Amino acid sequence: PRRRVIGQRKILPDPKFGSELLAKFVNILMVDGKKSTAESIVYSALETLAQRSGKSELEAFEVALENVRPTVEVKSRRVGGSTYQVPVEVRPVRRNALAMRWIVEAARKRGDKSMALRLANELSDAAENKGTAVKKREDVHRMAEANKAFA
Amino acid sequence: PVIKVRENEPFDVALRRFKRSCEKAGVLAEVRRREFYEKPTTERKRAKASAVKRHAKKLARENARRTRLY
Amino acid sequence: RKQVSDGVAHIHASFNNTIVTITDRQGNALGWATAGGSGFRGSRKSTPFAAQVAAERCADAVKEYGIKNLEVMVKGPGPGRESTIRALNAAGFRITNITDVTPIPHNGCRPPKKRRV
RNA sequence: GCUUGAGUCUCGUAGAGGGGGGUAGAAUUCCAGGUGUAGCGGUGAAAUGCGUAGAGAUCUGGAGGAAUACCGGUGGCGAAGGCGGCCCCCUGGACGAAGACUGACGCUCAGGUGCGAAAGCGUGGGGAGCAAACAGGAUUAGAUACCCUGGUAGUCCACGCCGUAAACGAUGUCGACUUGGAGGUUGUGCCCUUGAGGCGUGGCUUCCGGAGCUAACGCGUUAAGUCGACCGCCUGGGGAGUACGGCCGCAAGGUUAAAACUCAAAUGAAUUGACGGGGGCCCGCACAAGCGGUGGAGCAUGUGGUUUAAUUCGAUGCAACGCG
């Protein structure tokens, strides 16, 4: 805000295998404070994924997540009153949360028989680089490439 | 101005010495004055206004800014 | 496909556009590249990044000629010159020496009137 | 008569003081040529414009016109307007040193004469750049404006006219006297130049302040202090520096200069607020970062309108509208 820089919230880790990343993912994916429904969707999306790939659950989610990874962002600032968009190098902790947000935004569309089946389609479609979250990442990268004249 | 970068001299050294040459000569100020015609009124008023600002902060430097605040 | 070892780079930087022209030392050019020649239109034409990209395109404009080293002349004010000569050796060159050749009148001709906005 | 005011001469000095004539260098434009090629220019963004008939860039050369970077200065000179490369010719003034010489020759000045920025006018040249008018592109509700691309008179020269400016330190000229400090510029004397010094004395100038003055702001030895001499000018605001007449001018117009009528104020300086598309420093779910809504659908409820015999009354920008 205007003054503070206060310390971060510390959540409890992922129960099935201890990770902060999957606890952040179940917190992002949830709706109206329904933690149990969200973690059921996440688990039935990740155990049903590791047999599509072949590796185990966590690092398959990690290279489904790192393919959608924004290196840079755009921002809007002011120097002449002109107010253009200038690219910025993102911190990785907000890069990772923006990646999870884009994956969930992908999964809310492309409708089929489940939310977990939609996720297990989405993360594999991102992990072989043909999804729509990879389209969001390459559109962010394109909008920063076009605006590289300001740095 | 004229810079000749001789034997045993790196790149950014030479580039900074060229920038030092440009800031010694003041070529960009003398181009920036010659883009638009400032009237002789504006020239004399700029001269007098900058001079009264100059010495009117200078005598404040000399005796007004020498006494303590806290 | 005529060869010559050393030449002169002229980086004419205005406030709207930078033109890099690589000549020989007798003034005869070999090819040029501007800050508007590839993309980079309008407000993005005046930036130093456009001048860096212009130097990078004039670097490949003399791939046939095989230039070993060149002296770099700089004209005009604006966000041209330093980023241009810094990208000039980054695209691979030995800049021999640098001149600032911008025109200064001895009060020769009357400039246009000052803008109101 | 006298030398104290005013002047003359001898010696130097500093100076964009003035008039006439040359000449140099940088740059802009144009023309001719060489290399080379798809953009240039412009803007907040654009477009008009220029460009494949070869531009912009770049080099060699030519031709013109105008102004003189640096020095450059709260520096200098001039009565003011004003005056800025360098050299020469003609020429005005101011200042300093020590003397001499005339001996009140002085100060101010209505009418009069002269000079007097820029714009303008006449005649004859010249014309690079800039540029009223003008055109086109934008911006905009509109934009006969600001911004852009062009562009004519004009700006330049010679000779005449005009005779006005916020021609302003908004401060007439001359003389006398009255605490200080920091500087600048230009002479000059003395002491050991004993060392880039010191102690003096003259002219001009810049700032800050004391008494005093002033409505205050401020001015303050260069007075707006204390006085004297002469001149010009003012008498509420508007009408009005206007009309009519006169004089001047080629004209534009200048100068001189009312009245009827109308208002009870117009003004100056400062003060406390408020305001600013003024400045600086901050704060708030104010914005940003996010999550979820409302506006669309159906119903609930309140209001406005309309209706009605009555649709009781009140709240009705935030701060009324699931409110009393």
XYZ file of C-alpha atoms (C1' of nucleotides) in Angstrom:
662
model
C 0.000 0.000 0.000
C 1.110 3.542 0.749
C 3.387 2.691 3.670
C 3.802 -0.906 4.771
C 6.005 -3.726 3.482
C 4.656 -6.361 5.918
C 5.768 -10.000 6.198
C 4.130 -12.675 4.095
C 1.430 -15.156 5.020
C 2.655 -18.698 5.625
C 0.249 -21.430 4.501
C 0.294 -25.108 5.424
C 1.883 -27.437 2.827
C 0.380 -29.948 0.441
C -0.884 -33.018 2.346
C -0.393 -35.785 -0.261
C 3.217 -34.864 -0.812
C 4.617 -31.905 1.113
C 4.937 -28.866 -1.141
C 4.119 -25.178 -0.862
C 3.524 -25.029 -4.619
C 0.550 -27.356 -4.622
C -0.937 -25.661 -1.563
C -0.753 -22.386 -3.477
C -2.376 -24.152 -6.434
C -5.274 -25.545 -4.378
C -5.715 -22.080 -2.878
C -5.810 -20.448 -6.317
C -8.165 -23.027 -7.834
C -10.706 -22.954 -4.980
C -14.096 -21.207 -4.882
C -15.985 -19.635 -1.930
C -13.751 -21.184 0.695
C -14.265 -24.803 -0.381
C -10.865 -26.324 0.267
C -11.870 -29.996 0.236
C -13.566 -29.858 -3.161
C -10.573 -28.030 -4.629
C -8.010 -30.491 -3.295
C -10.133 -33.390 -4.562
C -10.052 -31.795 -8.023
C -6.288 -31.159 -7.787
C -5.458 -34.704 -6.699
C -7.734 -36.363 -9.256
C -6.076 -34.112 -11.842
C -2.484 -34.891 -10.873
C -2.616 -38.653 -10.249
C -4.525 -39.009 -13.524
C -1.780 -36.978 -15.211
C 1.332 -38.868 -14.084
C 0.117 -41.941 -15.987
C -0.418 -39.841 -19.101
C 3.174 -38.591 -18.893
C 5.064 -41.411 -17.173
C 6.990 -39.493 -14.521
C 5.673 -39.038 -10.999
C 3.144 -36.405 -9.999
C 5.092 -33.434 -8.617
C 7.754 -32.856 -11.267
C 5.249 -33.546 -14.042
C 3.224 -30.687 -12.585
C 6.493 -28.720 -12.438
C 7.224 -29.225 -16.101
C 3.652 -28.514 -16.927
C 4.005 -25.298 -14.953
C 7.397 -24.110 -16.174
C 6.370 -24.241 -19.832
C 3.880 -21.500 -18.969
C 6.351 -19.192 -17.327
C 6.399 -15.435 -17.961
C 9.950 -14.141 -18.197
C 8.820 -10.513 -18.412
C 5.630 -8.500 -18.022
C 4.361 -5.216 -19.307
C 3.464 -2.306 -17.022
C 2.134 1.204 -17.551
C 4.096 4.234 -16.303
C 4.287 7.975 -17.004
C 7.141 10.210 -18.188
C 5.723 12.738 -20.674
C 2.021 12.263 -19.998
C 2.164 9.881 -22.927
C 1.623 6.806 -20.677
C 2.920 3.813 -22.639
C 3.456 0.185 -21.646
C 7.034 -0.640 -20.616
C 8.217 -4.215 -19.980
C 9.563 -5.297 -16.602
C 11.491 -8.255 -15.231
C 9.142 -10.092 -12.910
C 10.045 -11.500 -9.527
C 9.804 -15.312 -9.675
C 7.368 -15.651 -6.747
C 4.756 -13.609 -8.607
C 5.805 -15.239 -11.883
C 4.872 -18.613 -10.405
C 1.523 -17.368 -9.098
C 0.719 -15.763 -12.451
C 1.550 -19.106 -14.063
C -0.882 -20.934 -11.780
C -3.496 -18.231 -12.398
C -3.142 -18.635 -16.171
C -3.428 -22.424 -15.875
C -6.657 -22.156 -13.877
C -8.003 -19.526 -16.297
C -7.272 -21.985 -19.100
C -8.986 -24.815 -17.231
C -12.188 -22.892 -16.506
C -12.750 -22.844 -20.275
C -12.408 -25.798 -22.693
C -15.424 -27.475 -21.182
C -15.765 -31.223 -20.794
C -16.912 -33.827 -18.282
C -15.078 -32.537 -15.192
C -12.926 -29.832 -13.706
C -10.211 -32.372 -12.906
C -10.477 -33.917 -16.373
C -10.249 -30.389 -17.769
C -7.084 -29.811 -15.709
C -5.544 -33.124 -16.756
C -6.162 -32.069 -20.330
C -4.776 -28.557 -19.711
C -1.516 -29.413 -18.003
C -0.579 -32.021 -20.591
C -1.561 -29.557 -23.348
C 0.772 -27.057 -21.686
C 3.499 -29.631 -21.054
C 3.826 -30.508 -24.722
C 3.401 -26.757 -25.602
C 0.056 -26.602 -27.516
C -2.330 -25.177 -24.913
C -4.049 -21.848 -24.507
C -2.091 -20.942 -21.379
C 1.030 -21.196 -23.545
C -0.805 -18.817 -25.898
C -1.254 -16.419 -22.978
C 2.453 -16.723 -22.143
C 3.583 -16.146 -25.719
C 1.162 -13.225 -26.052
C 2.678 -11.644 -22.933
C 6.124 -12.304 -24.425
C 5.020 -10.798 -27.742
C 3.607 -7.676 -26.070
C 6.924 -7.268 -24.269
C 8.918 -7.862 -27.470
C 6.936 -5.140 -29.250
C 7.545 -2.769 -26.338
C 11.283 -3.466 -25.934
C 11.971 0.067 -27.271
C 11.423 1.276 -23.705
C 13.656 -0.176 -20.992
C 35.476 17.084 -31.127
C 38.575 15.274 -32.387
C 39.388 12.074 -30.511
C 42.082 9.702 -31.748
C 42.127 6.406 -29.865
C 45.659 5.058 -30.160
C 47.388 1.765 -29.347
C 46.550 -0.290 -26.229
C 43.188 1.316 -25.411
C 39.861 -0.419 -24.642
C 36.411 0.375 -25.988
C 34.294 1.873 -23.194
C 37.280 3.930 -22.021
C 37.320 5.557 -25.465
C 33.538 5.978 -25.477
C 33.550 7.684 -22.069
C 36.442 9.923 -23.141
C 34.384 10.896 -26.190
C 31.446 11.723 -23.909
C 33.865 13.773 -21.819
C 34.903 15.579 -25.011
C 31.245 16.334 -25.826
C 30.584 17.626 -22.309
C 33.744 19.761 -22.310
C 32.818 21.390 -25.604
C 29.113 21.712 -24.812
C 27.953 20.856 -28.325
C 24.475 19.720 -27.293
C 23.742 22.925 -25.376
C 24.830 24.953 -28.402
C 22.584 22.903 -30.661
C 19.713 23.111 -28.142
C 19.920 26.903 -28.154
C 19.819 27.088 -31.956
C 16.647 25.087 -32.656
C 14.291 27.998 -31.958
C 14.727 31.746 -32.178
C 14.683 33.269 -28.712
C 14.045 36.998 -29.017
C 16.641 39.445 -27.610
C 14.070 40.271 -24.927
C 14.056 36.610 -23.895
C 17.872 36.478 -24.031
C 18.315 39.521 -21.771
C 15.539 38.437 -19.424
C 17.009 34.932 -19.144
C 20.443 36.436 -18.444
C 19.179 38.792 -15.738
C 16.854 36.218 -14.154
C 19.556 33.548 -13.990
C 22.007 36.095 -12.588
C 19.664 37.319 -9.845
C 18.891 33.679 -8.964
C 22.633 32.865 -8.968
C 23.819 35.604 -6.641
C 20.600 35.617 -4.570
C 21.260 32.048 -3.567
C 25.010 32.758 -3.395
C 24.795 35.459 -0.723
C 22.424 33.145 1.133
C 25.160 30.505 0.862
C 27.719 32.996 2.185
C 25.915 34.185 5.350
C 22.352 32.827 5.567
C 23.211 29.125 5.179
C 26.024 29.345 7.757
C 23.844 29.613 10.896
C 22.503 26.393 12.401
C 19.027 24.894 12.107
C 18.966 22.537 15.093
C 31.361 -7.049 -54.302
C 34.260 -4.595 -54.193
C 36.516 -4.879 -51.127
C 38.086 -2.143 -48.980
C 39.538 -2.514 -45.490
C 38.678 0.585 -43.466
C 35.822 3.063 -43.747
C 33.935 5.799 -41.918
C 30.680 5.413 -39.987
C 28.365 8.432 -39.932
C 25.649 8.342 -37.276
C 23.353 11.280 -37.998
C 21.081 11.380 -34.949
C 18.114 13.705 -34.993
C 15.376 13.845 -32.375
C 12.983 11.899 -34.575
C 15.268 9.381 -36.287
C 18.864 8.135 -36.433
C 20.543 7.208 -39.702
C 23.704 5.101 -39.710
C 25.648 5.189 -42.979
C 28.929 3.313 -43.384
C 31.119 4.795 -46.096
C 34.695 4.471 -47.197
C 37.117 7.232 -46.233
C 36.524 8.987 -49.557
C 32.908 9.579 -48.497
C 31.340 7.020 -50.811
C 28.710 5.019 -48.959
C 28.344 1.252 -48.761
C 24.806 0.946 -47.393
C 22.744 2.501 -44.648
C 20.232 1.636 -41.958
C 17.704 3.791 -40.138
C 15.748 3.658 -36.921
C 12.597 3.333 -39.017
C 13.884 0.841 -41.559
C 12.729 -2.186 -39.567
C 9.555 -1.808 -37.499
C 10.011 0.806 -34.820
C 7.620 3.526 -35.940
C 6.787 6.811 -34.281
C 7.506 7.262 -30.594
C 9.632 4.116 -30.715
C 11.716 5.612 -33.529
C 13.345 8.171 -31.251
C 14.510 5.733 -28.572
C 18.135 4.577 -28.196
C 16.996 0.984 -28.810
C 15.966 1.909 -32.343
C 19.443 3.316 -32.929
C 20.995 0.119 -31.569
C 18.874 -1.931 -33.988
C 19.859 0.437 -36.822
C 23.545 -0.185 -36.102
C 22.827 -3.930 -36.049
C 21.204 -3.784 -39.506
C 23.978 -1.675 -41.014
C 26.394 -4.262 -39.599
C 24.934 -6.916 -41.894
C 24.591 -4.403 -44.733
C 28.403 -4.615 -45.076
C 28.827 -8.386 -44.675
C 29.942 -8.619 -48.301
C 32.507 -5.853 -47.898
C 34.521 -7.232 -44.983
C 35.326 -4.106 -42.981
C 38.046 -4.526 -40.368
C 37.809 -1.179 -38.580
C 36.106 2.174 -38.938
C 36.207 5.653 -37.445
C 32.850 6.828 -36.135
C 31.544 10.347 -36.767
C 28.565 11.579 -34.746
C 26.137 14.315 -35.781
C 23.189 15.944 -34.099
C 21.723 15.681 -30.617
C 19.140 13.247 -29.371
C 18.826 9.660 -28.131
C 21.130 8.255 -30.807
C 24.891 8.310 -30.489
C 26.073 6.435 -27.359
C 23.774 3.411 -27.623
C 24.576 3.282 -31.334
C 28.360 3.182 -30.946
C 27.964 0.769 -28.044
C 25.926 -1.613 -30.199
C 28.322 -1.016 -33.105
C 31.160 -3.092 -31.640
C 28.696 -5.519 -30.041
C 27.719 -6.441 -33.591
C 31.463 -6.905 -34.147
C 33.856 -4.130 -35.131
C 36.894 -2.221 -33.959
C 35.885 1.428 -33.699
C 39.134 3.229 -34.404
C 38.301 6.719 -33.123
C 35.265 8.912 -32.599
C 34.467 12.429 -33.758
C 31.551 14.715 -32.978
C 30.925 16.461 -36.300
C 27.653 18.241 -35.527
C 27.089 21.589 -37.289
C 27.347 24.738 -35.194
C 26.695 28.081 -36.894
C 28.519 31.241 -35.904
C 25.060 32.823 -35.800
C 24.532 32.137 -39.493
C 20.819 31.694 -40.124
C 17.716 32.487 -38.131
C 16.041 29.468 -36.498
C 12.273 28.919 -36.704
C 10.016 30.428 -34.077
C 9.588 28.813 -30.678
C 6.623 26.471 -30.325
C 3.847 27.390 -27.918
C 2.947 23.864 -26.865
C 38.652 92.778 -8.839
C 39.127 87.110 -6.877
C 39.213 81.682 -7.859
C 36.000 77.938 -5.494
C 31.421 77.110 -10.350
C 32.111 76.861 -15.957
C 35.701 76.313 -19.655
C 40.988 76.031 -22.629
C 45.910 73.621 -23.363
C 49.958 69.988 -22.528
C 50.231 63.684 -21.436
C 48.021 59.161 -21.467
C 43.995 55.657 -21.104
C 39.790 52.172 -21.771
C 35.655 51.563 -24.909
C 29.695 46.476 -29.259
C 30.129 55.500 -29.495
C 29.265 56.804 -34.936
C 29.722 57.003 -40.485
C 32.359 54.715 -45.204
C 34.942 50.673 -47.388
C 36.962 45.847 -47.562
C 37.690 40.689 -45.907
C 37.529 35.858 -43.257
C 35.338 31.404 -41.161
C 31.150 28.218 -39.519
C 26.240 27.112 -41.013
C 21.286 27.005 -43.909
C 19.336 26.726 -48.943
C 20.009 25.915 -54.060
C 22.637 23.953 -58.450
C 26.070 20.192 -60.855
C 28.525 15.551 -60.155
C 30.216 10.667 -57.487
C 28.721 6.336 -54.081
C 24.279 3.925 -52.580
C 19.230 2.675 -51.412
C 14.152 2.376 -49.482
C 12.434 5.360 -46.746
C 12.650 10.657 -45.131
C 10.355 14.608 -42.646
C 7.012 15.703 -38.846
C 4.121 14.819 -34.336
C 1.473 13.767 -28.105
C -0.172 10.513 -32.184
C -0.787 11.429 -37.163
C -1.502 13.237 -41.898
C -0.442 16.952 -45.644
C 4.653 17.032 -47.957
C 9.148 14.748 -50.286
C 10.895 9.861 -52.466
C 12.210 4.266 -57.039
C 11.557 10.142 -62.508
C 16.413 7.705 -57.032
C 15.062 11.010 -51.943
C 17.082 11.405 -46.783
C 22.495 9.976 -45.857
C 27.396 10.816 -47.685
C 31.801 13.319 -50.451
C 34.041 16.832 -54.015
C 32.872 21.691 -56.031
C 30.244 26.083 -57.182
C 26.730 30.289 -56.321
C 24.313 33.531 -53.411
C 22.228 36.250 -49.200
C 22.089 37.181 -44.026
C 24.101 37.010 -39.203
C 28.701 37.218 -36.660
C 29.422 30.632 -31.946
C 33.640 30.722 -28.261
C 35.361 35.422 -25.772
C 30.579 37.192 -23.057
C 30.526 39.290 -18.138
C 24.504 42.158 -12.387
C 31.041 43.750 -18.526
C 31.679 48.458 -21.700
C 30.294 52.786 -24.567
C 26.235 56.280 -25.975
C 21.546 62.025 -24.237
C 17.992 58.472 -25.225
C 16.660 55.067 -29.286
C 20.760 51.774 -29.211
C 25.618 49.416 -30.329
C 28.830 42.361 -30.714
C 33.674 38.698 -36.096
C 38.505 41.074 -37.957
C 41.161 45.275 -40.554
C 41.647 50.164 -42.490
C 40.012 55.477 -43.422
C 37.112 59.825 -41.304
C 35.116 61.332 -36.482
C 32.307 62.457 -31.344
C 32.535 62.079 -26.106
C 34.008 60.528 -21.033
C 37.997 59.782 -17.435
C 43.104 60.346 -14.759
C 47.786 62.937 -13.553
C 50.330 67.305 -12.458
C 50.635 72.195 -13.881
C 49.446 76.672 -16.486
C 45.482 80.298 -18.727
C 40.661 83.125 -19.100
C 37.936 84.927 -14.967
C 30.989 83.956 -13.329
C 31.855 83.054 -19.306
C 26.640 79.578 -15.118
C 21.875 76.483 -14.198
C 17.094 75.615 -16.209
C 14.063 76.376 -20.294
C 7.492 77.771 -22.683
C 7.179 78.323 -28.353
C 11.618 76.409 -31.958
C 15.037 72.804 -33.977
C 17.379 67.974 -34.009
C 17.802 62.691 -33.030
C 14.236 58.872 -32.108
C 13.108 50.590 -31.574
C 9.924 47.826 -34.386
C 5.995 47.833 -37.699
C 4.480 50.838 -41.959
C 4.854 54.016 -46.625
C 7.628 55.804 -51.481
C 11.352 54.876 -55.313
C 15.437 51.573 -56.955
C 17.946 47.027 -55.975
C 18.532 42.300 -53.526
C 16.347 37.813 -51.619
C 19.783 32.322 -48.370
C 17.036 31.682 -43.690
C 12.730 33.200 -41.160
C 8.057 34.650 -42.007
C 2.208 38.434 -41.254
C -1.376 37.348 -45.152
C -2.520 32.545 -47.705
C -3.134 27.244 -48.642
C -3.368 22.259 -47.087
C -3.137 18.381 -42.791
C -4.629 17.722 -38.013
C -6.875 18.775 -32.930
C -11.804 20.001 -31.689
C -18.677 20.316 -30.488
C -16.682 24.109 -33.748
C -11.050 25.853 -34.530
C -11.356 31.344 -40.039
C -6.282 29.619 -33.129
C -2.242 27.135 -30.644
C 0.715 21.978 -33.383
C 2.551 20.291 -38.542
C 3.984 20.957 -44.072
C 4.500 24.901 -47.319
C 4.553 29.936 -48.206
C 4.057 36.100 -50.162
C 4.843 41.082 -48.406
C 8.404 42.120 -44.874
C 13.103 41.444 -42.605
C 18.612 43.319 -45.993
C 20.744 47.719 -48.939
C 20.559 53.168 -50.979
C 17.808 57.637 -50.471
C 13.249 60.051 -48.373
C 8.730 60.034 -45.079
C 6.449 58.402 -40.555
C 7.464 60.120 -35.160
C 5.036 56.164 -32.095
C 6.414 51.755 -27.592
C 5.593 48.598 -20.765
C 10.593 54.798 -25.629
C 10.418 51.802 -18.117
C 15.469 52.349 -13.000
C 6.878 53.180 -14.771
C 11.884 57.784 -10.793
C 12.775 65.633 -15.255
C 17.476 68.455 -15.240
C 21.335 70.780 -12.194
C 23.795 71.736 -7.480
C 24.646 70.996 -1.888
C 24.813 67.986 2.489
C 23.997 63.305 5.415
C 26.354 56.144 9.116
C 28.337 51.329 6.631
C 29.624 46.343 3.953
C 30.592 43.019 -0.045
C 31.837 43.429 -5.436
C 32.853 44.735 -10.665
C 35.277 48.035 -14.339
C 39.010 51.929 -15.755
C 42.927 55.583 -14.520
C 46.685 56.974 -11.085
C 50.304 57.915 -6.576
C 53.395 55.930 -2.715
C 56.122 51.792 -0.058
C 60.719 46.906 -0.315
C 58.488 44.414 -7.244
C 61.410 43.266 -1.049
C 56.862 37.244 -3.492
C 50.095 36.323 -7.704
C 51.743 42.361 -2.511
C 50.081 46.604 0.829
C 48.532 51.706 1.910
C 46.012 55.666 -0.934
C 43.232 58.732 -4.214
C 39.715 59.729 -8.885
C 35.411 58.282 -12.591
C 31.534 54.742 -13.737
C 28.608 50.640 -12.051
C 25.974 46.021 -8.996
C 23.803 44.138 -4.591
C 22.542 44.361 0.746
C 21.351 47.345 4.580
C 21.437 52.354 9.037
C 19.075 56.875 10.307
C 15.398 59.271 7.773
C 11.384 59.033 4.482
C 6.992 56.425 2.755
C -0.104 54.264 2.684
C 2.653 50.151 2.678
C 5.820 47.748 -0.557
C 10.312 49.574 -0.512
C 14.331 53.651 -1.352
C 18.580 54.355 1.171
C 25.477 58.803 -0.541
C 23.791 56.602 -7.933
C 17.720 58.433 -2.349
C 11.976 57.873 -2.970
C 16.542 61.411 3.232
C 17.561 66.966 4.224
C 17.385 71.455 0.853
C 17.636 75.186 -3.362
C 16.801 76.741 -8.897
C 13.927 76.150 -13.279
C 10.665 73.116 -16.355
C 6.692 69.608 -17.536
C 2.348 67.448 -15.638
C -2.395 65.802 -12.153
C -7.470 66.848 -10.015
C -13.260 60.504 -9.169
C -14.422 56.104 -12.790
C -16.449 55.506 -17.684
C -17.694 58.175 -21.983
C -12.192 59.264 -24.091
C -6.839 60.177 -25.440
C -12.818 59.727 -28.340
C -15.781 63.483 -31.424
C -15.400 68.399 -34.035
C -11.873 71.994 -35.572
C -6.531 73.273 -36.445
C -1.543 71.736 -37.791
C 1.582 67.854 -39.670
C 1.664 63.201 -43.140
C 1.651 59.896 -49.610
C -1.494 57.149 -46.488
C -1.815 54.519 -42.049
C -2.278 58.106 -38.709
C 0.165 61.496 -35.086
C -0.433 65.935 -32.165
C -3.678 69.300 -29.693
C -8.107 68.158 -27.142
C -13.999 68.511 -25.243
C -19.152 67.765 -24.058
C -23.936 65.683 -23.219
C -24.909 61.531 -20.491
C -23.992 57.702 -16.676
C -22.079 55.242 -11.661
C -21.123 55.844 -6.230
C -17.487 54.327 -6.638
C -12.779 53.161 -9.716
C -7.932 52.491 -7.558
C -2.966 51.452 -4.689
C -0.315 48.505 -1.097
C -0.751 44.774 2.295
C -3.744 41.023 5.331
C -6.833 36.248 6.682
C -8.846 32.530 3.959
C -10.207 29.784 -0.451
C -8.590 28.364 -5.192
C -4.724 26.959 -9.251
C -4.765 22.262 -15.802
C 1.607 26.295 -9.461
C 5.733 23.881 -6.323
C 7.519 20.614 -2.384
C 6.292 16.764 1.655
C 2.715 13.168 3.073
C -2.153 9.966 3.953
C -6.863 6.905 2.908
C -9.454 0.116 -0.686
C -7.850 6.618 -3.633
C -5.284 4.216 -7.647
C -2.345 0.095 -8.886
C -2.259 -5.892 -7.709
C -6.258 -9.292 -7.043
C -11.004 -11.610 -5.652
C -16.155 -11.183 -6.016
C -20.193 -8.402 -7.504
C -23.967 -4.475 -9.808
C -25.727 -2.811 -15.185
C -28.553 -7.983 -18.962
C -33.038 -12.268 -16.687
C -36.955 -13.349 -13.066
C -38.934 -11.959 -8.466
C -38.667 -8.885 -3.596
C -38.490 -3.842 -2.003
C -38.141 1.636 -2.178
C -38.573 5.879 -5.350
C -39.877 9.047 -9.778
C -43.624 9.534 -13.220
C -48.453 8.314 -14.658
C -53.199 6.930 -12.785
C -56.942 7.410 -9.157
C -62.315 9.053 -5.369
C -57.900 8.475 -2.478
C -53.177 6.279 -4.254
C -51.545 10.123 3.383
C -47.151 12.844 4.783
C -41.882 13.436 5.064
C -36.500 12.238 3.052
C -35.061 13.497 -2.456
C -26.074 14.714 -5.155
C -22.122 12.216 -2.190
C -24.822 12.980 3.112
C -32.967 10.577 -0.500
C -34.302 5.948 -2.858
C -34.979 -2.710 1.916
C -35.114 5.590 4.158
C -38.996 7.602 9.160
